[PDB]
RNA sequence: UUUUUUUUUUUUUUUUUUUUUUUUUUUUUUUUUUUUUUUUUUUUUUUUUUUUUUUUUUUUUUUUUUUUUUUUUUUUUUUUUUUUUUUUUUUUUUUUUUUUUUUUUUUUUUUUUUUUUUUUUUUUU
């Protein structure tokens, strides 16, 4: 009965494990990104540099949003690099989660607030809370050589929760789409049938 | 009428029973894990060692989440070991519940907070409360050679209750799925029909 | 007015003001309402499949005089 | 507030302060004493004295950056009157109540949503209900 | 004007239960609207998945048969009164300590008032 044995603290301390976040690309996915990104023209350190470019784009755009964003970085076009991320079966956000802190750190030092701040109607009090990959600010596996401002602050964290509501809302707006059929079964439910009915003028 | 007889305290004290938690794998299930895990390449003490690896993964991942997590441990790949647990008809959490304290103890001594802390939007005040197998911290049958910090603390316990709300929420998000049919009876209710309707802009 | 990339040589009044921002949110409700009024149109067919749903069928029914 | 100073329009200069991510008060806190000193020598009491209903006894206590009068880092070549006086300090505390009140009036606004979630709480819903004529 | 060249069989029931249970012969029409108003208003290009539970516990616990209607208002008064354009964030805590300490089983009701008198007196400056 090996499970009945006492592991002993001396052995527990000898394990020295590492945090294993799932909001970061898998090692093989990181390689998949290399297979695409390096193939795209990036090399060595440019791997991270270009991905940081995308993370900065994700800061102002988002998942496929940053994917659509063009512009040649120090290594290659954002879209090309985004394709590499897609080749790894990851969203740009997945990579951005890992590079969330350095990304925020860059903009924090350059005072470049999120461009979607306005779109999300985020209060000016929470100007720096409109960050899709804000979870990387807390993620122990997230990269970070130095963060100019403690955005992780609990006040900002609750603001990030409010920000999460935004993320949830949009999810309801798009993720909430009812995939009630695959082979075009419009006879069950027509396209755009899930669209909410127009609001009535009455209270009830 | 044997039930009318007095058992006598002298005999009650002679019983010396052991706590029987149901959040731990059954003896035969522990064996089932051996049948898989030992077969997977683990041996003797590695049985617990590898499972501890998974418990550490569960700390940052969860049930099938840690199951999907790869990486070769001192005995075998996490996924392979996870399969052994599945062979025993248990979730990784089931094993983790038993190895919750030593697992937490490892990270507590290494200062490795849960990677899903960010995802769950858990307040920094409760940074170490984001532990799926926190119940093992109180479970009398849970293994533990030495716990660096009394995470069981009542304040943390109420925080764990708040954490339970997270567990409940996600359960509502996934466990709340309406299994209203088996043989694809979409004519009764279409796939993804349970998806909540989009929120209205009005208060009522 | 909040967009960091938006052009601006000089703004006479700080319309970005948080009070105005919440008012802008209320304004967003207007934008949402009209979106519901037009964007909410159900594009349930392309090649004139009126047999599935007739034109202007999405039009809300007339309000009843009763509370229920 | 507009008006071209010896260097540039107040608003333009204010924009510079905003570019630095600071409120004018932030700069004023540093230049609170010299500022007060100017008006103290020119006998120019705060124009918002009336608005704040500050007692005439505390006419010179209606100063938003009064903290700069005590701040050791605040600039000051010479202060005509010791506004820091403890009596004035307690009056400044009373003045702080004004600052707190207005904060409650504006800072107290409930930012319960970002993306216009009026369905949770409608705009201006935080507005206090009208007072009843009864004592209870 | 566009499709074929797209996929199943080899998956499971019968032998499970009712009739013979109840209404008609109960009430409306002959009551009122049209001739009332919009389009020409705005969005897409916004973001998630890869997040977690089961294996947790009850039944076998108790009421009905207890009481009201037949009690009173409308016909009483406001609008036409005033604010915005006023100010904060960027300020600080956690990691501090208790449980395991003691009562119930101690005593009143059934004791007395209303029906007694002022306003219409003076300051601010």
């Amino acid at each position: 009965q090996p499970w009945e044995a006492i592991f002993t603290k001396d052995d527990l301390a000898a394990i020295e494990p590492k945090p294993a976040s799932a909001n970061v690309p898998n090692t093989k996915q990181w390689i998949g990104i290399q297979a695409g990104l390096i193939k795209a023209g990036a090399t060595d350190a440019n791997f991270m540099k270009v991905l940081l470019g995308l993370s900065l784009e994700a800061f102002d755009r988002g998942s496929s949003e940053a994917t659509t964003w063009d512009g040649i970085t120090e290594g290659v076009e954002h879209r090309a690099a985004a394709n590499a991320i897609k080749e790894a079966n990851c969203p740009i956000h997945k990579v951005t989660y890992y590079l969330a802190k350095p990304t925020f750190a860059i903009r924090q030092s350059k005072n470049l607030p999120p461009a979607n701040f306005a779109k999300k109607n985020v209060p000016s009090q929470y100007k720096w809370c409109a960050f899709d990959a804000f979870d990387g600010l807390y993620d122990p596996t997230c990269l970070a050589s130095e963060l100019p401002y403690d955005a992780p602050s609990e006040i900002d964290r609750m603001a990030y929760a409010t920000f999460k509501t935004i993320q949830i809302k949009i999810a309801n707006d798009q993720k909430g789409f009812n995939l009630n059929y695959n082979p075009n079964v419009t006879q069950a439910r027509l396209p755009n049938a899930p669209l909410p009915a127009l609001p009535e003028p009455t209270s009830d």
Side-chain angles (χ1 to χ4, degrees), chain A residues 52-72:
Chain A
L52 286 170
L54 283 174
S55 67
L56 290 163
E57 296 314 344
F59 198 102
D60 291 340
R61 293 299 305 278
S63 176
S64 72
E65 285 290 299
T67 299
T68 59
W69 183 257
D70 65 23
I72 298 170

Side-chain angles (χ1 to χ4, degrees), chain A residues 86-106:
Chain A
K86 289 192 286 180
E87 288 176 350
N89 300 317
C90 295
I92 290 173
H93 277 168
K94 184 64 74 182
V95 174
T96 304
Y97 293 144
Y98 183 72
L99 300 176
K101 288 175 81 176
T103 299
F104 187 99
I106 292 164

Side-chain angles (χ1 to χ4, degrees), chain A residues 2-18:
Chain A
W3 62 90
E4 296 294 329
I6 304 302
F7 199 78
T8 302
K9 181 64 181 182
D10 291 345
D11 295 341
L12 290 174
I15 293 168
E16 301 185 351
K18 180 180 177 180

Side-chain angles (χ1 to χ4, degrees), chain A residues 23-192:
Chain A
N23 68 354
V24 300
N26 184 290
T27 299
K28 72 182 182 181
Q29 291 180 305
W30 279 114
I31 293 168
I33 294 168
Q34 289 177 294
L37 180 53
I38 300 302
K39 173 187 69 189
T43 185
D44 298 326
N46 290 344
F47 176 84
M48 183 172 287
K49 291 178 183 179
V50 174
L51 293 176
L52 286 170
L54 283 174
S55 67
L56 290 163
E57 296 314 344
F59 198 102
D60 291 340
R61 293 299 305 278
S63 176
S64 72
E65 285 290 299
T67 299
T68 59
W69 183 257
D70 65 23
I72 298 170
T73 67
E74 49 278 18
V76 71
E77 181 185 349
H78 286 111
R79 300 186 56 258
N83 290 338
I85 294 170
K86 289 192 286 180
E87 288 176 350
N89 300 317
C90 295
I92 290 173
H93 277 168
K94 184 64 74 182
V95 174
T96 304
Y97 293 144
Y98 183 72
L99 300 176
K101 288 175 81 176
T103 299
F104 187 99
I106 292 164
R107 288 175 175 267
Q108 185 61 56
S109 68
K110 304 300 179 185
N111 299 316
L112 307 176
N116 295 353
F117 163 79
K119 295 172 194 171
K120 296 175 187 298
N121 301 318
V122 174
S124 64
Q125 183 68 51
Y126 309 125
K127 181 176 70 179
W128 284 99
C129 298
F131 184 24
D132 282 329
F134 77 85
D135 59 316
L137 298 173
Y138 302 89
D139 187 328
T141 65
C142 182
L143 186 68
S145 67
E146 186 280 345
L147 181 64
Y149 165 70
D150 288 345
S153 174
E154 189 65 36
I155 292 169
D156 290 343
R157 187 157 183 61
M158 292 298 96
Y160 278 132
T162 305
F163 173 71
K164 179 63 70 180
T165 299
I166 294 165
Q167 296 185 314
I168 292 167
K169 176 186 180 294
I170 299 300
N172 289 339
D173 293 339
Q174 182 175 343
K175 191 69 158 186
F177 286 158
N178 183 351
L179 299 175
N180 54 32
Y181 68 66
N182 293 359
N184 193 38
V185 183
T186 55
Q187 52 275 36
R189 282 291 183 275
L190 296 173
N192 289 299

